Design a protein around this ligand. Structure first.
Ligand SMILES: *[C@@H]1O[C@H](CO)[C@@H](O[C@@H]2O[C@H](CO)[C@@H](O)[C@H](O)[C@H]2NC(C)=O)[C@H](O)[C@H]1NC(C)=O
Ligand SMILES: *[C@@H]1O[C@H](CO)[C@@H](O[C@@H]2O[C@H](CO)[C@@H](O)[C@H](O)[C@H]2NC(C)=O)[C@H](O)[C@H]1NC(C)=O
Ligand SMILES: *[C@@H]1O[C@H](CO)[C@@H](O[C@@H]2O[C@H](CO)[C@@H](O)[C@H](O)[C@H]2NC(C)=O)[C@H](O)[C@H]1NC(C)=O
Ligand SMILES: *[C@@H]1O[C@H](CO)[C@@H](O)[C@H](O)[C@H]1NC(C)=O
Ligand SMILES: OC[C@H]1CNC[C@@H](O)[C@H]1O
Ligand SMILES: [Ca+2]
Ligand code: NI
Ligand code: NI
Length: 641
């Protein structure tokens, strides 16, 4: 079949860019403590122009101290009157992105909120001005402390919006001189935001972009009618195998074709979280071993390149895009400066399945496509060619330049299945490369941290992935034997996105660990009612954190201890009395081998040969009984898998 590409009677919609999400939750957690040069190479693969993924857009979670899928992320306001714009790693990531690409688009979106915003209720719309104050302070802080211009602000990730809040947010933004900041809504479904915009004139004026999640390449009529920009503000979320790459390739094309969506943002940016956490390895690439330095430049990186390296925000789709007769699709974009980019995909059904949604079988076969260039695209003589084959795979390999010497302005390709072609008048394409990273090693079977860092670059010790609550470096200037510790700093349950545990917890190590000995110095700050624990064989985290089983060694300031099989403390292995009070350092040791475990207090056996379920595996962990202050020091673990 012949497919005409032409700009004679106008253009399509303005292309807004391809991006990815860091956050929801703690997806970039393990990236920060990568040794150089590896950490910097990974960021180059993601954000350096004309190199790797070359992303146009970076979206980050505005941490609200709650569990938001693979962990918690710290807020800039743990408490009322608290301001701190140097917690976590999203500030750092955004700055790294801007250094490589100054034109990158920055977006922020809340998943959860600090509990104090709710004023007693678990609800961010009790005081609209207060919640707006919180969010806008985050944007101001981004500019004032990090020289970051946030381009787009969201509402509440995959949660109900309040129309009056969106309006108050706009007023708050303009009042602080942030008119340039745009609002995207509602980062959930097409409805009810689409119909709300049609029914409410004032709401229409304050919303700039309608952003839907996992729309299956389609939109809805009311969204078209609004005349707003339509984005797939969160998509993908599939394991970065060849299959996930196929999913990414197909939806990148068909989101605009089928659904008029001029931007697609993948969750997540990079899989830098323990793979056994929910949705493991669902990033554009993988970097889940800072201890070894090993990272995988997965195929979605090069799938992205086919569009990102040859398109920029401000470009325009041609009116002439669509599906191929024998399956697959093609899009075409111009910059208005005589350049032209053509992106063609022929992903088979079996090799492009996304998790959300899963498409009914469709068929793709061998085919010939003849592209004819009419209008101002006529005097194009030469097209650079880029090719990718997923499956016995090869990625982003430049092919021999294509020539249109005969004035027909036409060419012809044979398109097999699971293939990508990018045809462009751009000469800047490059498959970036670095020397291959170290091989993958397990988490060190012998690990220790004394948290003795006087000027930490980040707010938390490495490899500790908070799954409920928030743990930070802490300096106590008056105590010398525990001058530098790790502290759980939440004192009330957040306005939650997920089902956070009722106890705080941070996991670390190797999920495949079976036999282990965990030791840590603990400090209970709350008299009478306070409590802490250490644990091994913790099998679940993330949005499943309340599900976590394992062996949990608790001690309480009322002079007692418990040994449970679950974080929720419903199943008892052992319990009894102990010489434990608040505001006093203790050394807890927990040993687990096979069917039996023992617990030590200051090097003395508290319980021994206590029967636990076996087989069983999981991480090591520390935590507190509730959302309460407590300190930890001299963490050690020895384990075997
Ligand atoms: C949104 O995109 C759709 C295509 O998915 C446009 O609907 C028509 O699509 C057919 C092909 O199925 C084209 O031949 C028509 O030209 C399209 N309509 C028009 C008016 O051109 C639809 O127009 C788009 N809606 C927008 C841009 O608001
Ligand atoms: C295609 O795009 C390139 C890159 O933007 C254009 O080249 C730029 O042209 C502007 C003037 O319009 C110059 O200021 C830049 O220095 C150029 N950059 C580069 C890298 O060449 C180019 O004009 C466009 N058209 C064609 C036919 O290449
Ligand atoms: C964890 O400890 C258990 C308990 O000792 C180990 O299981 C034993 O392993 C030895 C050596 O292979 C066998 O001779 C025993 O018959 C096993 N007993 C049971 C009850 O399984 C287990 O191998 C250890 N696992 C690791 C990874 O070190
Ligand atoms: C898919 O399409 C080709 C040609 O159109 C046809 O030969 C083939 O049998 C089809 N296969 C299935 C499983 O539908
Ligand atoms: O598919 C999983 C994703 C859905 N949307 C929010 C993300 O945090 C993540 O949970
Ligand atoms: Ca210390
Ligand atoms: Ni300021
Ligand atoms: Ni497991």
């Amino acid at each position: 079949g012949a497919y005409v590409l032409d700009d004679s009677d106008g253009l399509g919609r303005e292309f807004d860019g391809i991006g990815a999400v860091s956050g929801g939750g703690a997806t970039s957690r393990l990236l920060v403590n990568y040794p150089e040069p590896y950490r910097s190479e990974i960021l180059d693969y993601l954000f350096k122009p004309n190199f790797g993924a070359s992303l146009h857009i970076l979206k980050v979670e505005i941490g609200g101290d709650g569990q938001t899928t693979d962990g918690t992320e710290p807020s800039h306001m743990h408490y009322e009157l608290d301001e701190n714009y140097f917690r976590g790693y999203e500030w750092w990531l955004m700055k790294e992105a801007k250094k490589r690409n100054p034109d990158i688009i920055l977006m922020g979106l809340p998943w959860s909120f600090p509990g104090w915003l709710g004023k007693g209720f678990s609800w961010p719309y009790v005081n609209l001005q207060l919640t707006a104050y919180y969010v806008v302070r985050w944007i101001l802080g981004a500019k004032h402390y990090h020289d970051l211009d946030i381009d787009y602000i969201g509402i509440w990730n995959e949660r109900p919006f309040d129309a009056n809040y969106i309006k108050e947010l706009r007023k708050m933004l303009d009042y602080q001189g942030l008119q340039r900041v745009r609002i995207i809504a509602s980062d959930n479904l097409w409805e009810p935001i689409s119909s709300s915009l049609l029914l409410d004139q004032e709401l229409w004026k304050v919303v700039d972009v309608i952003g839907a999640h996992y729309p299956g390449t389609y939109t809805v009529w009311n969204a078209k009618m609004s005349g707003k920009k339509l984005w797939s503000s969160e998509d993908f979320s599939t394991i970065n195998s060849n299959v996930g790459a196929g999913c990414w390739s197909r939806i990148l094309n068909q989101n605009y074709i089928n659904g008029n969506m001029t931007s697609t943002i993948a969750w997540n940016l990079v899989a830098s979280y323990y793979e056994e956490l929910p949705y493991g390895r669902s990033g554009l690439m993988t970097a889940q071993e800072p201890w070894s330095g090993h990272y995988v430049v997965a195929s979605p990186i090069w799938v992205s390149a086919h569009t990102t390296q040859f398109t920029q925000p401000g470009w325009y789709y041609l009116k002439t895009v669509g599906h191929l007769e024998k399956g697959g699709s093609y899009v075409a974009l111009t910059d208005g400066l005589g350049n032209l980019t053509i992106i063609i995909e022929t992903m088979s059904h079996q090799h492009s399945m996304c998790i959300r949604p899963y498409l009914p079988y469709y068929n793709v076969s061998h085919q010939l496509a003849t592209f004819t260039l009419k209008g101002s695209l006529r005097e194009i003589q030469e097209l650079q060619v880029w090719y990718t084959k997923l499956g016995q795979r090869l990625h982003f390999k430049q092919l021999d330049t294509l020539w249109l010497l005969d004035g027909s302005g036409s060419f012809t390709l044979e398109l097999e299945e699971d293939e990508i072609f990018t045809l462009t008048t751009l000469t800047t394409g490059r498959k970036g490369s670095y020397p291959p990273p170290p091989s993958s090693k397990p988490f060190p079977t012998n690990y220790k941290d004394d948290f003795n860092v006087e000027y930490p670059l980040f707010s938390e010790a490495p490899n500790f992935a908070d799954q409920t609550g928030v743990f930070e470096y802490y300096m106590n200037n008056e105590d010398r034997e525990h001058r530098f510790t790790l502290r759980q700093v939440l004192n009330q349950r957040p306005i939650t996105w997920a089902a956070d545990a009722s106890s705080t917890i941070s996991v670390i190590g190797d999920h495949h660990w079976t036999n282990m000995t965990v030791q840590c110095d603990v400090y209970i700050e709350t008299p009478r009612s306070g409590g802490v624990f250490i644990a091994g064989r913790v099998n679940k985290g993330g949005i499943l954190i309340r599900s976590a089983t394992g062996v949990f060694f608790w001690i309480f300031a009322n002079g007692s201890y418990r040994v449970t099989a679950d974080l929720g403390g419903w199943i008892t292995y052992a319990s009894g009395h102990a010489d434990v009070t608040a505001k006093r350092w203790y050394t807890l040791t927990l040993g687990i081998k096979g069917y039996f475990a023992f617990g030590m207090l200051n090097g003395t056996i508290l319980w021994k040969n206590v029967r636990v379920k076996y087989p069983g595996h999981g991480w090591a962990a520390i935590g507190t009984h509730t959302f309460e202050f407590a300190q930890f020091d001299n963490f050690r673990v020895e384990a075997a898998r």
